Amino acid sequence: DAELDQLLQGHYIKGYPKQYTYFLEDGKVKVSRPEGVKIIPPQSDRQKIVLQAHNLAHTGREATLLKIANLYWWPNMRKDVVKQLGRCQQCLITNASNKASGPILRPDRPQKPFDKFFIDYIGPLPPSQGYLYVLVVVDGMTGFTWLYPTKAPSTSATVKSLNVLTSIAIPKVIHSDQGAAFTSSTFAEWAKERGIHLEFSTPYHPQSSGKVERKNSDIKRLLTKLLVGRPTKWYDLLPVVQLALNNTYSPVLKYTPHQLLFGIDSNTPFANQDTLDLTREEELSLLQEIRTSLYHPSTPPASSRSWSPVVGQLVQERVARPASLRPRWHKPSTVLKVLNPRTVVILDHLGNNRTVSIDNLKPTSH
Amino acid sequence: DAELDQLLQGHYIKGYPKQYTYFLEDGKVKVSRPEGVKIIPPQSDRQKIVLQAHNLAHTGREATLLKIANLYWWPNMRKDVVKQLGRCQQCLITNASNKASGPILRPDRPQKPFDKFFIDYIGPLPPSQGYLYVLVVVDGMTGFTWLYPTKAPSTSATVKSLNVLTSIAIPKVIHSDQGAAFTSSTFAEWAKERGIHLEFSTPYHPQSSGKVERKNSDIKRLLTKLLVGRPTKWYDLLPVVQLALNNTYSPVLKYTPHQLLFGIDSNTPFANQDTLDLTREEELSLLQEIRTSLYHPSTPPASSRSWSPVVGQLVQERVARPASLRPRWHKPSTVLKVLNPRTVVILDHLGNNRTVSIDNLKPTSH
Amino acid sequence: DRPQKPFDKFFIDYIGPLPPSQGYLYVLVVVDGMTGFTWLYPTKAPSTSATVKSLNVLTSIAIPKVIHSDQGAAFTSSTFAEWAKERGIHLEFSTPYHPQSSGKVERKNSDIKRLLTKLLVGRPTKWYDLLPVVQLALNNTYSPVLKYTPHQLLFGIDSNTPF
Amino acid sequence: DRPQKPFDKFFIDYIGPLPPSQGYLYVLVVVDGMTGFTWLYPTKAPSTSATVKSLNVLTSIAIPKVIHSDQGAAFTSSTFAEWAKERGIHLEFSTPYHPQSSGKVERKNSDIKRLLTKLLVGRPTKWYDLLPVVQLALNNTYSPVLKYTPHQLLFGIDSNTPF
DNA sequence: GCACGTGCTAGCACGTGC
DNA sequence: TGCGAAATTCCATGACA
DNA sequence: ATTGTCATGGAATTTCGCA
DNA sequence: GCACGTGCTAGCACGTGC
DNA sequence: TGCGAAATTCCATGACA
DNA sequence: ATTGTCATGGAATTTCGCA
Ligand SMILES: [Mn+2]
Ligand SMILES: [Mn+2]
Ligand SMILES: [Mn+2]
Ligand SMILES: [Mn+2]
Ligand SMILES: [Mn+2]
Ligand SMILES: [Mn+2]
Ligand SMILES: [Zn+2]
Ligand SMILES: [Zn+2]
């Protein structure tokens, strides 16, 4: 009853409107409002009340306000409700987000063949010839692809395959996901010896390896079609699949990967002859004209309710593998650096620096 | 060289344009076209050629045409390409669809409490007190919900729970998914004795039980928040969760489920008193005014590339649980009856009648 | 003053011993004072233990402002005292040897006592199974004084089990 | 007539025996006739078995119109005959005791023979490991007659391993 | 040696057939 | 230049994780 | 410390054969 | 008794810490 | 009727499967 | 023979206190 005494005396207090009659009854200070008569508790009591009505079900803004509304009234009640919701640790770490991620970037295509290799593992598959996994290697510019059968997705097996591959040429960058065979020390020491730079996707985000992941689909599709009504023995089909895909038209490019790598068809079925009367040199100059004039898509329009990150903003990381009835979000953290409008470095909950995709972040509410 | 003889003589044949000179060389009949010179094989040879170029990689319309284009030319080549694609069994059963499902129906809300019960099981969960599952029962109109702890999701345990529930009242319809405890003979014989009609969702389609499935979320959310930083012993929290949710505002309704069931708040915290001076009869008449004037949403606008089903159309069912490198679609079947613009009865691959949601169908291409 | 309502006051009392039906001997009668609505929970004892157990089930559905009961052991113990205060329930007791409820409850309580004893004639050994049928019966039985059933006064709707 | 191109004709021949490097004794030299590009596959025998095995690896990358080779056993067997016809490869043979390729291939084949024998001096016991280094070397070694490298004529680009 | 972090697909339960 | 048919391009969807 | 992709088939538009 | 159909969540592999 | 602040409603997103 | 839902918090609009 601090300033509540003043209002009872008829004095004016900024916020509470004057066309309403405020009184005293049963010890408590009330007000006569359209809905009915409501209690006006002192400011000291107000924090406690909002917490008692939230903790009923951990309700959000509107559901909380309606509870308190049944008994009480005061100015800007919601100001005090969101005040508690911003601090109640359990709600912030269990609640889902209602904000979309900003729209995808489409990175420029690598310019020349052998600039960027994208790699990734497939499986475990039905055992064929004692082989279980397939290491898949896609060249960025062409889309050309090599397939290797391994008995495990180890660094050891990944070494031996790239060794046979690299005899043809050596790439500038190799891009992988943070899979354990690809982040080993032994594998980095292998990249160092050959002068190749290693590049890693942000964790729990396969989109980033989308080039090789997309090629895995084409590989499973054709494998499947060729094993219909027959035991699933894939081993001896890998070289057939490698060849068919390498020579198959991307309809929006008008070219096959074989064509973007060599500029001329080999002795495969239905071969393009169109550049028949040209010397090699007139072909090779044409290939460079095509290679710089390929189709490339533009980033899509944002969602009407997306968010995009900023230095010093409060964000929370998606818990990688939460157990049942456990929260899906980590405690809040601060954005240190914004690498692009979809990639970010945070000071995590360890607290180390971590590089994450915004698809595993959410803006902290309030 | 059937009608190819005529064209060589200069006669006109409907389809092949006359401003081009067609000749004979190395035994084969060619044509001089802008792109270069192309072979014109006899109609008898044409089916074989389109199949040889498809089977390279099981390519679709455009990728196939471009292969054949390198060597051949004839009128409406694509007519012959889609002809093979409509019949090549492997492509039809492995390929993905590029057509969206028609837009959801929002069924009218049940009119009075106890018209429709929606049920469903939760778990297995972390063992608490030797209890593993939770049978969840939601009343359509109110949203009011009862929770029961069971040691398994059996008909036996489902019997015993609904028996304690039904002492309060008996519902007209009980709606479940096709889960094995709910489709047992023993359970149907239980429904028969009490005069309740049993109703079943279409299989592999949880949306249909969306009312209870949505309530499972609210149940896990609050359970989670209340077990933060503490061993996950849920058993003794079930009655607390049942109560809090039953008395929590749906912001777009402005009411709690307790309120839509009884018309007045019991002795729970922050109780609505607003109807204080009315007799019971003035309350109960008000409750019916509210119950008929609740919010209800309208079906969303279609996708620019959706499909909606028709009797006698060719469709294919999504294989429920395909093994690896196996096709994701069943052989084509015919639509017998269209129950609503999202529900359909087919003569399957057994061939029995089956009732499916259009979200597990795709229009057969070609 | 203000009109009587549901959840305003519940009346509770024990019936038994009875024939060993499925291992139980008693029944806890709960009756809302404005609706006459009725819950019946069987027990193996007229103890404080069995009362809280049953009533926890009931008060996880709705919660009364007041409980009324005789001065039987189970209600006057200080254990049941601390249970009623945790949940905000005010306690009320009759005076010894002079039972008091209302017109409406005295009669309802009577029927329950009569319908119960009747199945104790017709199907006199196994009564545990028959309770839910009785509760439905009692909650759809029409009241002479008011012109609706307890089910009707509680949910503002007809029943799907008319009697 | 029409200009020479890659994948037009590959030349192939065996080198060995050699010192037991990691269990192998021979090498299969493959050289594209227009590019001078070169693949080297080690084997444990100059047999038809080892030829198909290696060449399957190579012809799952690209496929030549023609193979040329001496009348060594492995190429003139009827097993290798049926392998070349399955894949649409026309076969060509030199005349006995008078080897014939072209200017470009005769010299390349020579270097391979020289660079190989050199590591058979410097690191003379374990050569199996060193092949990939040799192939890179041979495919980035500049040609006097034309003004580009095999790598350059094959991919229309520079290398990341200049030599 | 065993838990952790990152990458993947298996497997259990229930009620009903043969 | 203008018309109808044919060829060629447009682009939402869905699977790879 | 980094970033989605592209085969696919009905729809929508462009071109083309002819006069 | 064991495979099937419908409903659910577990679990294995690899390379690196302590 | 008209103004700025406050209260109240609008509605995309995401999890339940 | 059947069919998505609704809590949530910034944005967008409506109402309200005052003169
Ligand atoms: Mn991977
Ligand atoms: Mn279920
Ligand atoms: Mn008594
Ligand atoms: Mn030789
Ligand atoms: Mn992958
Ligand atoms: Mn469920
Ligand atoms: Zn909270
Ligand atoms: Zn096909």
Q: How far is the CA of A201 from the C1' of E7 (A)?
A: 12
Tokens of C159: 């029943």
Asked whether B325 and A227 are in contact (CB, 8 A), the reply is yes
Identity of the amino acid at B152? A
In this complex, the answer to whether residue B231 has its CB under 7 A from any atom of chain F, a nucleic strand, is no
> Quick check: is A11 in a domain?
yes
C-beta atoms of B272 and A70 within 8 A? yes
Tokens of D130: 């060193």
B positions 178-217 inside 8 Å of A (CB): none
Tokens of B327: 């096709």
Residues 272-331 of A with CB under 7 A from strand G: 297
Q: How far is the CA of A305 from the C1' of J12 (A)?
A: 13
Asked whether A178 and A209 are in contact (CB, 8 A), the reply is no
Identity of the amino acid at A33? R
Taking the alpha carbons of D132, D136, D138, D139 in that order, is the dihedral positive or negative?
Answer: positive
List, as residue ranges, the binding site of D for Mg(2+): 8, 70
Question: Distance between alpha carbon A333 and the CA centroid of its chain, in Å?
Answer: 18
Give the Cα-Cα-Cα angle D145, D150, D156 (nearest 5 degrees). Answer: 110
A24's enclosing H/E stretch is: strand A22-25
d(CA A58, CA A81): 12
Asked whether A171 and D160 are in contact (CB, 8 A), the reply is yes
Residues with Cβ within 8 Å of A305's Cβ and at least 6 positions away in sequence, in order, are: A98, A99, A100
C-beta atoms of C2 and B276 within 8 A? yes
Distances (CA, A) of B235 to A60, B126, B162, B227, D138: 25, 10, 19, 12, 74
Identity of the amino acid at A49? I
Closest listed residue to residue A243, CA positions, set B63, D60, D89 = D60
Q: How far is B262 from chain C (nearest CA, A)?
A: 5
Is A9 in the same domain as A66? yes
D10's enclosing H/E stretch is: strand D10-15
Residues with Cβ within 8 Å of A11's Cβ and at least 6 positions away in sequence, in order, are: none
Question: Distance between alpha carbon D5 and the CA centroid of its chain, in Å?
Answer: 17
Asked whether D42 and D149 are in contact (CB, 8 A), the reply is no
d(CA B269, CA B267): 7
d(CA B136, CA B146): 6
Phi, psi dihedrals of residue A328, rounded to the nearest 5°: -90, -5
For residues B109, B112, B114 and B118, what is the CA-based torsion angle, rounded to 10 degrees?
Answer: 0
Closest listed residue to residue B262, CA positions, set C62, A279, D122, A171 = C62
d(CA B289, CA A179): 61
d(CA D134, CA D151): 14
Closest listed residue to residue D25, CA positions, set D49, D43, D6 = D43
- Long-range CB pairs of D140-146 (<8 Å, 24+ gap) are D141/D111, D143/D36, D143/D104, D145/D103, D145/D104
Alpha helices in chain C (DSSP H): 48-58, 73-76, 78-86, 103-122, 131-140, 150-155
Residue A199 is given by DSSP the state E
3-state SS assignment for residue C135: helix
Distances (CA, A) of D33 to B261, B348, D51, D135: 88, 59, 19, 16
Give the Cα-Cα-Cα angle B242, B247, B250 (nearest 5 degrees). Answer: 115
Identity of the amino acid at A243? L
Is A173 in the same domain as A223? yes
d(CA A347, CA A354): 7
> Quick check: is B109 in a domain?
no
Q: In total, how many domains does chain B have?
A: 4
The CATH number given to whatever domain includes residue B225 is 3.30.420.10
Taking the alpha carbons of D63, D65, D70, D76 in that order, is the dihedral positive or negative?
Answer: positive
3-state SS assignment for residue A301: coil
Is B176 in the same domain as B239? yes
Asked whether A109 and A141 are in contact (CB, 8 A), the reply is yes
**Burial status of residue A88 (CB atoms within 10 A of its CB: 0-12, 13-18, 19 or more):** middle
Asked whether C12 and C108 are in contact (CB, 8 A), the reply is no
Asked whether A350 and A339 are in contact (CB, 8 A), the reply is no
Q: How far is B306 from chain A (nearest CA, A)?
A: 21
> Quick check: is B132 in a domain?
yes
d(CA B194, CA B172): 10
Residues with Cβ within 8 Å of B160's Cβ and at least 6 positions away in sequence, in order, are: none
Q: How far is the CA of B252 from the C1' of I9 (A)?
A: 9
Q: Collect all residues of chain C within an 8 Å Cβ-Cβ radius of residue B166.
A: 132
Is B133 in the same domain as B221? yes
Is B226 in the same domain as B278? no
Identity of the amino acid at B94? T
Region at B59 (left for phi over 0; alpha for psi -120 to 50; beta for the rest): beta
Residue A329 is given by DSSP the state B
Identity of the amino acid at B261? L
Is A184 in the same domain as A262? no
d(CA A107, CA A115): 14
Is A139 in the same domain as A222? yes
Resolution, given in Å to one decimal, reads 3.0
Distances (CA, A) of A18 to A13, A15, A28, A32, B148: 9, 9, 19, 12, 52
> Quick check: is A110 in a domain?
no
Q: Report whether A265 belongs to an annotated binding site.
A: no
d(CA B306, CA B363): 10
d(CA B58, CA A222): 7
Tokens of B142: 């109110």
Interstrand relation of A361-363 and C66-69 (parallel, antiparallel or unpaired): unpaired
In this complex, the answer to whether residue B60 has its CB under 7 A from any atom of chain J, a nucleic strand, is no
Residues 215-234 of A with CB under 7 A from strand G: 218
d(CA C155, CA B316): 47
A334's enclosing H/E stretch is: strand A333-340
Q: Encode A140-161: b = buried (16+ Cβ within 10 Å), e = exposed.
A: bbbbbbbbbbbeebbbebbeeb
Tokens of A84: 């508690």
Give the Cα-Cα-Cα angle B191, B195, B201 (nearest 5 degrees). Answer: 50
Tokens of A224: 């499947």
Method of determination used here:
X-ray
The CATH number given to whatever domain includes residue A26 is 1.10.340.70
Rounded-to-5 percentages of helix, strand, coil across chain D? 40, 20, 40
> Quick check: is A69 in a domain?
yes
d(CA A11, CA C146): 52
> Quick check: is A109 in a domain?
no
Phi, psi dihedrals of residue A179, rounded to the nearest 5°: -55, 145
- State the residue for tokens 């028996």: B163
C38's enclosing H/E stretch is: strand C38-43
Is A310 in the same domain as A339? yes
Subunit partners of chain C (3 or more CB pairs within 8 A): B
Interstrand relation of B343-347 and B333-340 (parallel, antiparallel or unpaired): antiparallel
Closest listed residue to residue D45, CA positions, set D18, D5, D8, D81 = D18
Domains of chain D (ranges; CATH) run 1-163 (3.30.420.10)
The CATH number given to whatever domain includes residue A255 is 6.10.20.110
Asked whether A318 and A361 are in contact (CB, 8 A), the reply is yes
Interstrand relation of D90-93 and D66-69 (parallel, antiparallel or unpaired): parallel
Q: Collect all residues of chain A within an 8 Å Cβ-Cβ radius of residue B66.
A: 249, 251, 254
Query: How many CA atoms lie less than 13 Å away from D107 in the CB half-sphere?
Result: 13
Q: How far is the CA of D85 from the C1' of F8 (A)?
A: 38
Residues with Cβ within 8 Å of A50's Cβ and at least 6 positions away in sequence, in order, are: A64, A68, A77, A80, A81, A83, A84
Residue A327 is given by DSSP the state -
Domain final position from A65, A96, A127: A96
Identity of the amino acid at C152? Q
> Quick check: is A280 in a domain?
yes
Domain final position from A294, A326, A350: A294
Asked whether B139 and B286 are in contact (CB, 8 A), the reply is no
Asked whether A177 and A200 are in contact (CB, 8 A), the reply is yes
d(CA B135, CA A76): 41
Tokens of A301: 């329009």
d(CA A235, CA A227): 12
Q: Which of B167, B171, B267 sits opposite C64 (nearest CB)?
A: B267
* Partner residues linked to A173 by β-bridges: A116, A197
Q: What is the 3-state secondary structure (H, E, C) of chain B?
A: CCCHHHHHCCCCCCCCCCCCCEEEECCEEEEEECCEEEECCCHHHHHHHHHHHHCCCCCCHHHHHHHHHCCECCCCHHHHHHHHHCCCHHHHHHCCCCCEECCCCCCCCCCCCCCEEEEEEECCCCCECCECEEEEEEECCCCCEEEEEECCCCHHHHHHHHHHHHCCCCCCEEEECCCHHHHCHHHHHHHHHHCCEEEECCCCCHHHHHHHHHHHHHHHHHHHHHCCCCCCCCHHHHHHHHHHHHCCCECCCCECHHHHHHCCCCCCCCCCCCCCCCCHHHHHHHHHHHHHCCCCCCCCCCCCCEECCCCCCEEEEECCCCCCCCCCECCCEEEEEEEECCEEEEECCCCCEEEEEHHHEEECCC
Closest listed residue to residue A181, CA positions, set A219, A213, A133 = A133
Tokens of D100: 């014939």
Tokens of C65: 């402002």
Asked whether C159 and C151 are in contact (CB, 8 A), the reply is yes
- State the residue for tokens 């009242």: B169
d(CA A254, CA A293): 12
d(CA A178, CA A191): 15
Tokens of C28: 């806890």
d(CA C80, CA C46): 13
Closest listed residue to residue B317, CA positions, set B272, B266, B274, B358 = B358
Domain hosting A260: range is 249-294
d(CA C56, CA D110): 96
Q: How many other C-beta atoms lie within 10 A of the C-beta of residue B283?
A: 18
Distances (CA, A) of C21 to C12, C42, C109, C110, C119: 21, 10, 21, 22, 12
d(CA B227, CA A148): 48
Rg of chain B over CA atoms, in angstroms?
Answer: 31
Size of interface A-B (CB pairs under 8 A): 140
Identity of the amino acid at A247? N
Residues with Cβ within 8 Å of D102's Cβ and at least 6 positions away in sequence, in order, are: D33
Phi, psi dihedrals of residue D39, rounded to the nearest 5°: -110, 140
C69's enclosing H/E stretch is: strand C66-69
The answer to whether A169 faces chain D, any CB pair under 8 Å, is yes
Asked whether B61 and B88 are in contact (CB, 8 A), the reply is no
Strands (E), A26-128: 28-33, 36-39, 100-101, 116-122
Give the Cα-Cα-Cα angle A180, A181, A187 (nearest 5 degrees). Answer: 120
Q: Encode B171-196: b = buried (16+ Cβ within 10 Å), e = exposed.
A: bebbbbbebebbebeebeebeeeeeb
d(CA A220, CA D130): 35
* Partner residues linked to B197 by β-bridges: B173
Give helix C103-122 / helix C131-140 axis angle, nearest 10°. 140
Residues with Cβ within 8 Å of A155's Cβ and at least 6 positions away in sequence, in order, are: A181, A182, A184, A186, A187, A190
Tokens of A158: 């990944």
The secondary structure of D28-61 as a DSSP string is: EEEEETTT--EEEEEES-SSHHHHHHHHHHHTTT
Is B166 in the same domain as B181? yes
Q: How many other C-beta atoms lie within 10 A of the C-beta of residue B282?
A: 11
Is A119 in the same domain as A237? yes
Interstrand relation of B36-39 and B28-33 (parallel, antiparallel or unpaired): antiparallel
Tokens of D119: 């590591």
Is A222 in the same domain as A311? no
Ligand at shortest distance from the CA of A182? 1
> Quick check: is B218 in a domain?
yes
Residue nearest to nucleotide F9 (CA to C1'): A252
Is B143 in the same domain as B242? yes
**Burial status of residue A261 (CB atoms within 10 A of its CB: 0-12, 13-18, 19 or more):** buried
